Write a structure and sequence with these properties.
Helix content of chain A: 10-25%
CATH topology of the largest domain in chain A: FAD/NAD(P)-binding domain
Protein name (chains A, B): Coenzyme A disulfide reductase
Largest sheet of chain A: 5 strands, parallel
Strand order of the largest sheet of chain A: 3-2-1-7-19
Keywords (chains A, B): FAD, Flavoprotein, NADP, Oxidoreductase, Redox-active center
GO molecular function (chains A, B): CoA-disulfide reductase (NADPH) activity; flavin adenine dinucleotide binding; NADP binding; protein disulfide isomerase activity
Bound molecules: ligand CA6, flavin-adenine dinucleotide, chloride ion, magnesium ion
Structural class of chain A: alpha/beta
Subunit structure (chains A, B): Homodimer.
CATH superfamily of the largest domain in chain A: FAD/NAD(P)-binding domain
Strand content of chain A: 25-35%
Oligomer: homodimer
Enzyme class (chains A, B): oxidoreductase
Distance between the termini of chain A: 57 Å
Number of strands of chain A: 26
């Protein structure tokens, strides 16, 4: 079949690559509205912090390399502006010529993702971070203006990683957030170490704070405070790139996302949707789920590839919502339903705080593990872990447990790999099980 | 019930404590043949290494504290010398006075564990390591004799830990082993980094080598080599402490262990056996298993506590044999059937070698993960992982998978916690699933 793909990054380029792996004869074309395909979204803050300095890490492919290795045609600076589903074409705008045209397809795959929100100030010193063009612009503004002092707005993983990286680059960031609900994928009371790490390094922050006015480098805040900053990075949420889809017969939800089935089909024949734009359901509970992260994009890419050119018995089973972020010395990880989704269940909570490993083994740090479960069937609903060591391991194990519909009580049976540098004879995970009794 | 426990460490002290949690009325007495209860067997190599300098870390309780806090009576230097199972008493030797006596019981719990084998040489410079008394003796011997050259015999995980610690203490160890099967819970080819770390540090080793004769500090070897050593630490395997049991009606296997059911009952009513002395079966395949490690001792202790004083529908479901050791910069972990046990199955092997985390993120290292599956049902039989980073995490996740008899193909669905310091959007575990076709 002729295959058209919208977006050439996490979902799009992966899906197209996976299809080629299976089908060597279908013609495949990808339209990407911006300059680069296959950029490393998740590497971006580390590029800014000069942790990553080889561009070969920031960008996996050029369209030329992509064609030469995989025979996939990628048109950058081409923005799809409409989907004409009844005639099986998309309308595409060549941004270089400002000429538009129709491209036909047998199968269409939508992976446009999402864009960064902006606060909307008229400001030459304010930037968002979503792609490599953004990253290049920030790096350039920093150098050309000898930036020292940077204001970071927002407190999600993107803003937190940018802050840490700006600090390590040798700059002087300040963090503000409109409320005190930082890092909201994590249980609110488990985020204290973020503030501790800031304090330890004498990095200023103000919560319940906003930009009120901007005049050159003079920044006036809601609190009444006035300071001067050389630069601002806004990380104040995202929104779905689905405007171009609204005129079509494709069903969108009221927030602009695309509900899909377990084959990542939309309501329209021959049209699939994957990545941040797509919504689905949880694997372990009968609720809708939207998990705009890397894992879901890659997994859907593979499933769509099988559907089109491989084994169409292969279907999605739902999300668990596993997620993680590093902030300075600490790791923050969670899986399962979001904090706000718990109220839909009659649940209880159990928790343990314990050294990640043997106390007498040097380098210990306490690890807080919390697990929520359903009282009506003992099923695990959510888990969260925070500590300098061992949090990722604990959450991945609980992710596998939930995949298998394990009960909280069954966690006593988890046979951990134990030696002093790694865990305990009754691991934190085991202790969750004993304490639920 | 009146409860008598034999052995006061991993199984015995733990089981007694777990019983008290549930039962505040019953009289509980533990007999321990040596000086110390509740020593940290696992910490002992690190004591020798002076990594653990403070004894509070090597000893968790005294009989006196155990009584004040738990109202359990612990009699040290008291060796149980016979089980009078028909009258329900045990014979006990007070080693201080050399007088014996009978102690009655309603329930008897046997956790006597295992003793170190010895090569049988007459030598004042040779030591084994099994308890805190052994540790104090080794430490004292090194100080008293200004030991520099040390011969470490055996390449089990304990001996490797001892070697590493002697090295970090400033001593100069040499490793020998009677065969080339070092660290034998791990795939043989995956043990190479042990030998790499030794080579890197100019720590001598000789495999397929044995002691021929000892003449003072002069050691004659099977190879014909003769060298001078100030000290010898032999780690040449263990034997079960079951001599005191043979006269009773308790069924022993031919190696001296006690087969038990999933309630950890012996063939004799009211007698339980746990810890290194007991044998059981695997959880994921129908084979007999013996897994003489900490997790099993602690798990059995809880189950026996529930049987006696709690919910007696709680039963063991078998072992997976999860195990791990650290040796210098590398981690070595495996789970499932032993290498020698694979031949009872029609099996295939899948493997990946990939960065533990994102390539661009610093301090990355190659992680080798290998998975064996049964061709008749796609079920995972065994997994192994070796590397400086991430091996413990992958093996724990796979232990949780096997607990659920998950197939190799379903690893494709494992929802990992992804950010650049931790893994990949398609983790090594997912990759095993994709490569299984
Ligand atoms: C933060 C956000 C995540 N963002 C991204 O991932 C965006 C950038 N990514 C992309 O554009 C694509 O995902 C690329 C093109 C980089 C990767 O495509 P694929 O995942 O299809 O893998 P690839 O074709 O590059 O193959 C390399 C490696 O994978 C093996 N392989 C892939 N699939 C399979 C299957 N299904 N079965 C067996 N093996 C498979 C393949 O063999 C391969 O080894 P080799 O290529 O042989 O040497 C995260 S971020 C971006 O890191 O910042
Ligand atoms: C290597 C080799 C393994 N060796 C050993 O284990 C050495 C010998 N061990 C022992 O003697 C026992 O395990 C001791 C006595 C050390 C521990 O007794 P147990 O009951 O585990 O533990 P304890 O009573 O001390 O409780 C402490 C902690 O856990 C909670 N807890 C225990 N059981 C339960 C249950 N069933 N349910 C809920 N909670 C339980 C307990 O309340 C207490 O918590 P807090 O800290 O106040 O929360 C290894 S090594 C390390 O070198 O020895
Ligand atoms: C800074 C940053 C850090 C992140 N870190 C993590 C992390 O640590 N862990 C994690 O799991 N996730 C992380 N993510 C999220 C992860 O990158 C996304 O979940 C993933 O990229 C989603 O893939 P996607 O294809 O749906 O969207 P994208 O990868 O963003 O790709 C969408 C592409 O479609 C293009 N497009 C949109 N509309 C059109 C159109 N009309 N025509 C043509 N092209 C169009 C866009 O230009 C864009 O290039 C991070 C994201 C960012 C921005
Ligand atoms: C140096 C070392 C390091 C280790 N490291 C690890 C590790 O990293 N990870 C891991 O999982 N496992 C490790 N282990 C193994 C772990 O310690 C054992 O699996 C665990 O202790 C088994 O507990 P047990 O109660 O059966 O025996 P033990 O803990 O050894 O206790 C048995 C006790 O019973 C006493 N006893 C025996 N006979 C009698 C009798 N007749 N009368 C009275 N008392 C008696 C003994 O003196 C002994 O104190 C290590 C062991 C050692 C020795
Ligand atoms: Cl091209
Ligand atoms: Cl054209
Ligand atoms: Cl056309
Ligand atoms: Cl808010
Ligand atoms: Cl369900
Ligand atoms: Cl006494
Ligand atoms: Cl005396
Ligand atoms: Cl680490
Ligand atoms: Mg640079
Ligand atoms: Mg139209
Ligand atoms: Mg000391
Ligand atoms: Mg199944």
């Amino acid at each position: 079949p002729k295959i058209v793909v919208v977006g050439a990054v996490a979902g799009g380029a992966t899906c197209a690559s996976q299809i080629r792996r299976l089908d060597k004869e279908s013609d495949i074309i990808i339209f990407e509205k911006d300059r680069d395909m296959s950029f490393a979204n998740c590497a971006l803050p580390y590029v800014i912090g000069e942790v990553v300095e080889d561009r070969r890490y920031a960008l996996a492919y050029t369209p030329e390399k992509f064609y030469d290795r995989k025979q996939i045609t990628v048109k950058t600076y081409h923005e799809v502006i409409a989907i004409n589903d009844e005639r099986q074409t998309v309308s595409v705008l060549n941004r270089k010529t400002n000429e538009q045209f129709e491209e036909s397809y047998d199968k269409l795959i939508l992976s446009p993702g999402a864009s960064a929100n902006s606060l909307g100030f008229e400001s030459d010193i304010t930037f968002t971070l979503r792609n490599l063009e953004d990253t290049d612009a920030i790096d350039q503004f920093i150098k050309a203006n000898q930036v020292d002092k940077v204001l970071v707005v927002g407190a999600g993983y993107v803003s937190l990683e940018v802050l840490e990286n700006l600090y390590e680059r040798g700059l002087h960031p300040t963090l503000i957030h409109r409320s005190d609900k930082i890092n909201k994928l994590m249980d609110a009371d488990m985020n204290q170490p973020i503030l501790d790490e800031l304090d330890k390094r004498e990095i200023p922050y103000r919560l319940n704070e906003e930009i009120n006015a901007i005049n050159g480098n003079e920044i006036t805040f809601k609190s009444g405070k006035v300071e001067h900053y050389d630069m601002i990075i806004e990380g104040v949420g995202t929104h779905p790139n689905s405007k171009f889809i609204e005129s079509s017969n494709i069903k969108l939800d009221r927030k602009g996302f695309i509900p899909v089935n377990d084959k990542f089909e939309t309501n329209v024949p021959n049209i699939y949707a994957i990545g941040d734009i797509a919504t689905s359901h949880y694997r372990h509970v009968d609720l809708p789920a939207s998990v705009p992260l890397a894992w879901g994009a890659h997994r859907a890419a593979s499933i769509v590839a099988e559907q089109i050119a491989g084994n169409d018995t292969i279907e999605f089973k739902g999300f668990l919502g596993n997620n993680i972020v590093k902030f300075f010395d600490y790791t923050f990880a969670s899986v399962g339903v979001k904090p706000n989704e718990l109220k839909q269940f009659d649940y209880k909570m159990v928790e343990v705080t314990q050294g990640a490993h043997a106390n007498y083994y040097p380098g210990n740090s306490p690890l807080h593990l919390r697990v929520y479960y359903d009282t009506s069937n003992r099923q695990i609903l959510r888990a969260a872990a925070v500590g300098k060591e061992g949090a990722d391991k604990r959450i991945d194990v609980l992710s596998m447990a939930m995949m298998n519909q394990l009960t909280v009580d069954e966690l006593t049976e988890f046979e951990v790999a134990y030696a002093p540098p790694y865990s305990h004879p009754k691991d934190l995970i085991n202790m969750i099980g004993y304490k639920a009794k």
